[PDB]
Ligand binder design. Structure first.
Ligand SMILES: CC(C)CCC[C@@H](C)[C@H]1CC[C@H]2[C@@H]3CC=C4C[C@@H](O)CC[C@]4(C)[C@H]3CC[C@]12C
Ligand SMILES: CC(C)CCC[C@@H](C)[C@H]1CC[C@H]2[C@@H]3CC=C4C[C@@H](O)CC[C@]4(C)[C@H]3CC[C@]12C
Ligand SMILES: CCCCCCCCCCCCCC
Ligand SMILES: CCCCCCCCCCCCCC
Ligand SMILES: CCCCCCCCCCCCCC
Ligand SMILES: CCCCCCCCCCCCCC
Ligand SMILES: CCCCCCCCCCCC
Ligand SMILES: CCCCCCCCCCCC
Ligand SMILES: CCCCCCCCCCCC
Ligand SMILES: CCCCCCCCCCCC
Ligand SMILES: CCCCCCCCCCCC
Ligand SMILES: CCCCCCCCCCCC
Ligand SMILES: CCCCCCCCCCCC
Ligand SMILES: CCCCCCCCCCCC
Ligand SMILES: CCCCCCCCCC
Ligand SMILES: CCCCCCCCCC
Ligand SMILES: CCCCCCCCCC
Ligand SMILES: CCCCCCCCCC
Ligand SMILES: CCCCCCCCCC
Ligand SMILES: CCCCCCCCCC
Ligand SMILES: CCCCCCCCCC
Ligand SMILES: CCCCCCCCCC
Ligand SMILES: CCCCCCCCCC
Ligand SMILES: CCCCCCCCCC
Ligand SMILES: CCCCCCCCCC
Ligand SMILES: CCCCCCCCCC
Ligand SMILES: CCCCCCCCCC
Ligand SMILES: CCCCCCCCCC
Ligand SMILES: CCCCCCCCCC
Ligand SMILES: CCCCCCCCCC
Ligand SMILES: CCCCCCCCCC
Ligand SMILES: CCCCCCCCCC
Ligand SMILES: CCCCCCCCCC
Ligand SMILES: CCCCCCCCCC
Ligand SMILES: CCCCCCCC
Ligand SMILES: CCCCCCCC
Ligand SMILES: CCCCCCCC
Ligand SMILES: CCCCCCCC
Ligand SMILES: CCCCCCCC
Ligand SMILES: CCCCCCCC
Ligand SMILES: CCCCCCCC
Ligand SMILES: CCCCCCCC
Ligand SMILES: CCCCCCCC
Ligand SMILES: CCCCCCCC
Ligand SMILES: CCCCCCCC
Ligand SMILES: CCCCCCCC
Ligand SMILES: CCCCCCCC
Ligand SMILES: CCCCCCCC
Ligand SMILES: CCCCCCCC
Ligand SMILES: CCCCCCCC
Ligand SMILES: CCCCCCCC
Ligand SMILES: CCCCCCCC
Ligand SMILES: CCCCCCCC
Ligand SMILES: CCCCCCCC
Ligand SMILES: CCCCCCCC
Ligand SMILES: CCCCCCCC
Ligand SMILES: CCCCCCCC
Ligand SMILES: CCCCCCCC
Ligand SMILES: CCCCCCCC
Ligand SMILES: CCCCCCC
Ligand SMILES: CCCCCCC
Ligand SMILES: CCCCCCC
Ligand SMILES: CCCCCCC
Ligand SMILES: [Cl-]
Ligand SMILES: [Cl-]
Lengths: 680, 680
């Protein structure tokens, strides 16, 4: 083994700078930087196409023998859940369920072309559907007057058509906003969605879905709520009118709920013995339709059912832009929430599978999906969190599984929709609630973060509470800001350490940590692992004066008290020699006799104007009582901050900067030795 | 001169830990910490009294011969401006001007006892007065019905009394809120008001005052505005109805404005020849009253005047708590803004005079002043920024100058108020606008910050724009949040440096800076002066792969391409030896041949779970291509973050940590030498 051997002079800043000559920066002109960015080599255009059409990259690289079985199983398992979720979330959007089926077909196909994630399930989302239904009923209330040429027994078809128009308009506007944000590179903000924040946000979204499904589980009529405390209002309303529940709807839904839970437990426990998981949503739906049609519950027990599902696809139709001025705010909110839900879950799966997702491409894909789908009578979509978990956890590899699920939805739309007309809405509710279980499993993060980082546990809990009680829009921005403020908290509560020296080395460690490091007599070394900006500087100065035990104000007060008791451009030197008489020093209380204070700046990333003022004050106050202050390990950035401020207006302070703590200690000891040499 | 000499073994983490034994922490029980905090020694209670009654400290220490002349001159100069400001801001509060005089007397006396700043002028403030007038006219509109037993020629006395009741109620509530915040130690938030933020905020407040004075300068009638864009609305309204201006009011106000400007220029230019500045506000007021009374403008030209000022003080009266539920929101806002204005200017002067102000004591003093003053018919007060500048800049030392100014106000209240009844409101407006000049001088900060720190210039401009276009309440919190987010920006744009070694030393500096430092062959050293948390980790990894020129993905791709071209608990080792055939290596493109990458962690303050995942990925990806990754200079906090996460689940990574960059370089070179020794 070799050894660490260093033999060099003491490196103060002027001494080290004498050995360094400034290098010539290579010319980097902006005009040439733009010119070299427009070469348009074929590889560059191929990379651009891959960026904007990801299917052009991962489809030719499809490992058929390694991906086809997993994609097929995942596609079937995703489709059997996609159908009831589409119907239920269409109900949440105040539109006929067939439009939820449309929203489960076109955007998934488009996302298979434009999307970057290969595990999320694109489709209707409960929170987005709730927002769409809110704007739809605000623009088209239940007591609206329509001169549609019908008798007093109105079938509510015209009201449904008007609400569909409103939903398509808001969907087109939200898609336009999402596409514009993706073009303007707004997706960079996805970097501010940390893992605890994402998981707390998604758990809160799952609670939102569960709350939105309660009225359909119980069969009660409840006013629509959207905004702050909407989850609380919805739960309160459902519990308030729970006395008017449909007992048959609740019984059927609870039977489906229990059977689904049992089947999911069976699948999980026998995963190793089952070649593929049994699709239980298909059996749940079919059995439900059998029970409702066979006993004819729809009017026998007034059980709410899915209703008529017209067959066939609709021709493209232009949404009316005339409603934009009435919906744009909602369109903005839906755009934001849709992005936040899509990029969160995507990240959650990408980190699980060792790849990365482009936020800008996610925004572009969402915008194109929503805007083009609005032409095909599709309301605003997002990522379905529970269905994304199902798709990922059933062996899903690429987005071809989503294409297979969309093919199943298309089969329902074209030929077999009429078979589900008697399916009870309660059954749909139960299915959704059951599939929320995996989402709720994320609560297991609370102990884990409690063991790993209480700051990140705070981020998790704050994000959960915010996204729950406020909306998924206001709660998300609140959580992002608070998570960023945790960094300010970290800087405002740093580790203030007094350093001692490991004998016969140059290693300086916390004096209260290892029992072998010893403080150097006459020298105090103070260290902060944080910047010294405005929110920090006063705490840093107080901590220095408290932890080192060297308070210049206390020293001055003791000097004055001892004096009273014994009674019965040019710059002055920074350190004023203590002209304290020895006769008065006889009454001076004993102390540590510290002549130098070393400030360890190795971990100080930056210093602002307020921090520079604090540092100058520290130097002046300590020099007034005849104590030297040295800065050790100042980075080039910190030295530049000191120079941009008026810290080195007196050039003498250049002598206070040393390369390392050992350099400063050796320089201080050398200064003391020279002072003793010239004393006598 | 001595020399830097170090001779020791290479300090990897296990080697250094072998030399260190954990020290025993001294017992610090919370129960004993509370017990020692309740000793109640006489010095402790004296310090408590000094904290809560600052006058008990600085008054006995009053240097009479050194303070009396400055305090007297400052008191006269402050009072002559305090009278017109009180009248004008009472007009802004929709209350009779005598109540502004009351608000200029009691709170100043109380703040002389409870306040910590010794230079700010306590009294009515234009923004606080505008908020008070807004709530007063909202609760008591101009078209209110009062059965007061009067004829059709109502004198608006009952409406004024009702508005006074509303103002007193909101003042009492705001004072209670301020006192409670001071007790709950909310004043700590004053640490988040940095100097650029404070100066931008105060400049925006000055613009608010100037805007509020315009209608009285021109004599036009304008609807009250309060809230977002209130300054824009007020300026637009004044400019809209400027065609109905009173030409006589504008002429008198402009004459006073010009004479005041000339007098202030004379005072500034002849400060060295004048024993004391000439109080020009007194002459401006007196002359104005002479012109208005002598020519009898009040009805001859319909010039708005101050009006009747009743003599004598009012007995204490309890404000009606019954209005609290109607005003509490406004009371909250007024409490916040009043604090923000008071603690900002206070800090601005404390930093100017080398002392410090307690934010909690400022909150307590403001709350007591407002709550007690509401009993004496005083509406909510704050610090007057322009008058504080006048008081500080005229030789003010303590708050006895404010007491003298209050004595002048009391003299006006008791005996000589009737003399000012004909004083034109336009004159008051002009006086206020003139005294805003010093505030506007703060715009000179823009070039200064442009030269010192563009981040702090951004803070200044953002605070100014926010506090101007939004209110002083919403703009302030927006500015505080954005100023804190500048730290996030700093962490997200750090200095990524490739380090080279200064020959014959252990100094490692940026390779592109000094032309004497040389990169060590086979070794890449990468440094970031920032933490590696979630908002940083991806950028840090990309910057490492880009700046070092060592991209493991590019290496793997080149290896595969060369292979194709040539064709025509136990853990595995972290670094996989490159099993690349030499025959295939003949087609391998030439490279730097880097065997070790050193990550400089000396400036990394903390690392979160996302950053630890990124670091583990970096280590794994570089080891997959047979490249070692070393961490140099990891702090105890960073090592603890790595340990709390599952970074050292494989104990082998403990060997990747080195005390310094030179330690890591020597260890890497030793590893390479040993590998060559065992090769053959
Ligand atoms: C920095 C710390 C204190 C977090 C700040 C969170 C801020 C940005 C949050 C918390 C409460 C939020 C408000 C809560 C409710 C509403 C009403 C809604 O109709 C419009 C948005 C609005 C007005 C929100 C705006 C954003 C808001 C003010
Ligand atoms: C970087 C910073 C600005 C991020 C946080 C900004 C927050 C604090 C700002 C941005 C937008 C602001 C809102 C904009 C408009 C209004 C309406 C007004 O009638 C009450 C205040 C309120 C509701 C503001 C509250 C504060 C607010 C939410
Ligand atoms: C053990 C000392 C640290 C404890 C940290 C606990 C963090 C709890 C955060 C709760 C946030 C709730 C937001 C409403
Ligand atoms: C192990 C972590 C020590 C700190 C625990 C307490 C963390 C509290 C974080 C509060 C952040 C507040 C941001 C507004
Ligand atoms: C020279 C490159 C840096 C320039 C920094 C200029 C900062 C301007 C900030 C403007 C903020 C305005 C808020 C509305
Ligand atoms: C000399 C300073 C270099 C940086 C100049 C540009 C500063 C821009 C700061 C933007 C902060 C944004 C916070 C939301
Ligand atoms: C940045 C997102 C908004 C892009 C502009 C959309 C404006 C609506 C289109 C005009 C229709 C009248
Ligand atoms: C990606 C395919 C987009 C096809 C869009 C066709 C829109 C036709 C509108 C016709 C309106 C009458
Ligand atoms: C997010 C930027 C605005 C989004 C587009 C708004 C379009 C409003 C149209 C109003 C027409 C009168
Ligand atoms: C981002 C491109 C979206 C294209 C969808 C159609 C946009 C125009 C709507 C119809 C206008 C008549
Ligand atoms: C924290 C500031 C508010 C303190 C509580 C004030 C509540 C008003 C007093 C009750 C009057 C009805
Ligand atoms: C600091 C002096 C406070 C005096 C407060 C007296 C309040 C008297 C109220 C009488 C109401 C009729
Ligand atoms: C800032 C905390 C609240 C301030 C005090 C509110 C008092 C409201 C009284 C309502 C009475 C019905
Ligand atoms: C913080 C103490 C303020 C005291 C002022 C009086 C508070 C009570 C108001 C009158 C209630 C009847
Ligand atoms: C606790 C939820 C709110 C109250 C729900 C019960 C309302 C009355 C039911 C009879
Ligand atoms: C689901 C079968 C049981 C519930 C419905 C029948 C009994 C109640 C009728 C109102
Ligand atoms: C596979 C779909 C089976 C649907 C069962 C219910 C059919 C009702 C026919 C009356
Ligand atoms: C993605 C393929 C879309 C095809 C839509 C065809 C609609 C025809 C309606 C008559
Ligand atoms: C990550 C960016 C979050 C932005 C939230 C904006 C909410 C707007 C609600 C209308
Ligand atoms: C896999 C299902 C593909 C779509 C079948 C469409 C059948 C239409 C029958 C009218
Ligand atoms: C609302 C239901 C919450 C269920 C949490 C279950 C956590 C299990 C972790 C093992
Ligand atoms: C709101 C419900 C929270 C329940 C937390 C339980 C965590 C269990 C992890 C084992
Ligand atoms: C080891 C136990 C960790 C518990 C942390 C979760 C607390 C939840 C409070 C809401
Ligand atoms: C609004 C109150 C914010 C309080 C922040 C406390 C931070 C403590 C850092 C030591
Ligand atoms: C530019 C300020 C707003 C317009 C002021 C002029 C309004 C019309 C005056 C005749
Ligand atoms: C200051 C101007 C005095 C003369 C004004 C003449 C015009 C008066 C119009 C009401
Ligand atoms: C010092 C105050 C002088 C006031 C001048 C105006 C007096 C008007 C009397 C009619
Ligand atoms: C600070 C002294 C307050 C004295 C108020 C006296 C009021 C008397 C009214 C008759
Ligand atoms: C420094 C703390 C700023 C808090 C601003 C709160 C504004 C509330 C307006 C009602
Ligand atoms: C310096 C002025 C002190 C107050 C004088 C009060 C005189 C009252 C006369 C009725
Ligand atoms: C609104 C008036 C602004 C005046 C700025 C003057 C700055 C002078 C700096 C020397
Ligand atoms: C809004 C007016 C800004 C004017 C800035 C002028 C700065 C001059 C400093 C010398
Ligand atoms: C040296 C010139 C500095 C100018 C910075 C101020 C720019 C003001 C833009 C609003
Ligand atoms: C809302 C958009 C915020 C953009 C922040 C950009 C920070 C750049 C750091 C490199
Ligand atoms: C190389 C073609 C891949 C599939 C492209 C489909 C049309 C965008
Ligand atoms: C290299 C294969 C390109 C075509 C893939 C299949 C497209 C339908
Ligand atoms: C590795 C893929 C082999 C099969 C190619 C596709 C055959 C349909
Ligand atoms: C989800 C794949 C189809 C169903 C397979 C069931 C195997 C027991
Ligand atoms: C995705 C559900 C498929 C339902 C099929 C019904 C029988 C063709
Ligand atoms: C309330 C209905 C009771 C019968 C169904 C119970 C299902 C577990
Ligand atoms: C093992 C799951 C049992 C579920 C019983 C029914 C719950 C509603
Ligand atoms: C349609 C077949 C689904 C199950 C595939 C795997 C069977 C071993
Ligand atoms: C063997 C599992 C049966 C599950 C049936 C579920 C019907 C809803
Ligand atoms: C799922 C099969 C239900 C059969 C019900 C028959 C009632 C006549
Ligand atoms: C009114 C409830 C707001 C919850 C916000 C939580 C932020 C820590
Ligand atoms: C932990 C820092 C939070 C500061 C927020 C701003 C308070 C005014
Ligand atoms: C030592 C007394 C100073 C003045 C106190 C006045 C009453 C609080
Ligand atoms: C030591 C002087 C105490 C009294 C100061 C004056 C109080 C009116
Ligand atoms: C030395 C004490 C001076 C006290 C001055 C009091 C003036 C009211
Ligand atoms: C240093 C103060 C001397 C004067 C004391 C006060 C005399 C009235
Ligand atoms: C402001 C002190 C009183 C006025 C003095 C004027 C001296 C020319
Ligand atoms: C503060 C202004 C004083 C005005 C005095 C008027 C003549 C006694
Ligand atoms: C508009 C009035 C003009 C006469 C006064 C001018 C003062 C400078
Ligand atoms: C030296 C100041 C001259 C002021 C002239 C009048 C401006 C309105
Ligand atoms: C009342 C006198 C004010 C001026 C004091 C200073 C005179 C030299
Ligand atoms: C010599 C300065 C005279 C200033 C008079 C101001 C009257 C408003
Ligand atoms: C300031 C003196 C004004 C005198 C006006 C006299 C008019 C009769
Ligand atoms: C609507 C104007 C808001 C200005 C805020 C400025 C924040 C940078
Ligand atoms: C969603 C954006 C949060 C604000 C980040 C600002 C960091 C410079
Ligand atoms: C019964 C009250 C419910 C509050 C909201 C829970 C999510
Ligand atoms: C458990 C549900 C039973 C429904 C019976 C309907 C006749
Ligand atoms: C004339 C428009 C004025 C806008 C507000 C300026 C402060
Ligand atoms: C400067 C304007 C003077 C007006 C006098 C009116 C009598
Ligand atoms: Cl979901
Ligand atoms: Cl002011």
């Amino acid at each position: 083994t070799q050894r660490y051997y260093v033999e060099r002079p003491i490196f103060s800043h002027p001494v080290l700078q004498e050995r360094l000559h400034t290098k010539d920066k290579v010319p980097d002109s902006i005009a040439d930087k733009l010119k070299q960015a427009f070469t348009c080599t074929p590889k560059k255009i191929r990379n651009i196409i891959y960026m904007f059409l990801p299917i052009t990259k991962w489809l030719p690289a499809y490992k058929f023998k390694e991906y086809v079985l997993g994609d097929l199983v995942s596609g079937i398992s995703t489709g059997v859940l996609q159908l009831p979720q589409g119907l239920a979330f269409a109900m949440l959007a105040a539109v006929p369920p067939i439009f939820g089926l449309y929203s489960s077909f076109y955007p998934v196909i488009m996302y298979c072309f434009l999307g970057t994630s290969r595990h999320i399930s694109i489709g209707p989302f409960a929170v987005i559907s709730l927002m769409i239904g809110g704007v739809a009923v605000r623009l088209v209330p239940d007591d609206i007057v329509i001169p549609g040429g019908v008798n007093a027994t109105n079938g509510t078809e015209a009201r449904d058509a008007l609400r569909v128009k409103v939903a398509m308009s808001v969907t087109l506007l939200s898609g336009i906003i999402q596409f514009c944000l993706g073009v303007c590179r707004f997706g960079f903000v996805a970097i501010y969605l940390t893992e605890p924040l994402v998981r707390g946000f998604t758990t809160a979204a799952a609670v939102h879905v569960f709350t939105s499904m309660l009225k359909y589980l119980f069969g009660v009529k409840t006013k629509r709520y959207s905004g702050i405390f909407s989850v609380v209002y919805s739960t309160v309303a459902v519990l308030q009118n729970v006395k008017n529940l449909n007992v048959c709807s609740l019984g059927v839904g609870l039977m489906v709920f229990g059977l689904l839970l049992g089947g999911k437990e069976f699948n999980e426990r026998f995963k190793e013995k089952l070649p593929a998981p049994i699709p239980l949503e298909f059996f749940a739906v079919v059995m439900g339709t059998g029970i409702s049609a066979g006993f004819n519950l729809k009017e026998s027990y007034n059980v709410d059912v899915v209703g008529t599902l017209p067959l066939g696809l609709l021709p493209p139709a232009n949404p009316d832009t005339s409603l934009f001025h009435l919906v744009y705010v909602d369109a903005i909110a839906i755009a934001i929430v849709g992005f936040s839900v899509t990029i969160s879950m995507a990240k959650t799966l990408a980190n699980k599978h060792g790849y990365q997702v482009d936020g800008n491409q996610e925004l572009i894909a969402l915008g194109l999906c929503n805007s083009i789908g609005s032409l095909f009578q599709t309301f605003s979509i997002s990522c379905s969190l529970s269905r994304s978990l199902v798709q990922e956890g059933t062996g899903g590899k690429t987005q071809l599984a989503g294409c297979l699920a969309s093919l199943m939805i298309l089969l329902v739309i074209l030929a077999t929709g009429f078979l589900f007309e008697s399916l009870p809405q309660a059954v749909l509710s139960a299915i959704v609630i059951v599939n929320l279980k995996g989402m709720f499993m994320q609560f297991s993060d609370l102990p884990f973060f409690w063991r790993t980082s209480k700051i990140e546990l705070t981020i998790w809990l704050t994000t959960f509470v915010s996204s729950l009680f406020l909306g998924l829009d206001y709660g998300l921005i609140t959580a992002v800001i608070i998570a960023l403020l945790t960094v300010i908290y970290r800087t405002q509560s740093p580790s203030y350490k007094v350093l001692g020296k490991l004998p016969e080395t140059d290693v300086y460690i916390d004096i209260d940590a290892y029992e072998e490091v010893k403080e150097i007599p006459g020298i105090k070394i103070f260290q902060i692992n944080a910047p010294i900006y405005y929110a920090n500087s006063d705490l840093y100065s107080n901590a220095l004066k408290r932890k080192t035990g060297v308070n210049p104000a206390v020293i001055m007060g003791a000097r004055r008290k001892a004096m009273r008791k014994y009674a019965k451009v040019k710059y002055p030197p920074i350190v004023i020699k203590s002209t304290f008489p020895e006769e008065m020093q006889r009454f001076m209380p004993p102390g540590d006799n510290v002549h130098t204070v070393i400030l360890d700046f190795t971990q100080v990333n930056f210093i602002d104007s307020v921090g520079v003022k604090t540092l100058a004050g520290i130097v002046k106050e300590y020099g007034d009582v005849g104590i030297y202050v040295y800065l050790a390990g100042c980075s080039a950035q910190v030295v530049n901050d000191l120079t941009r401020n008026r810290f080195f207006e007196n050039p003498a302070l250049w002598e206070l900067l040393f390369h390392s703590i050992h350099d400063a200690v050796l320089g201080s000891q050398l200064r003391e030795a020279l002072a003793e040499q010239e004393a006598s």
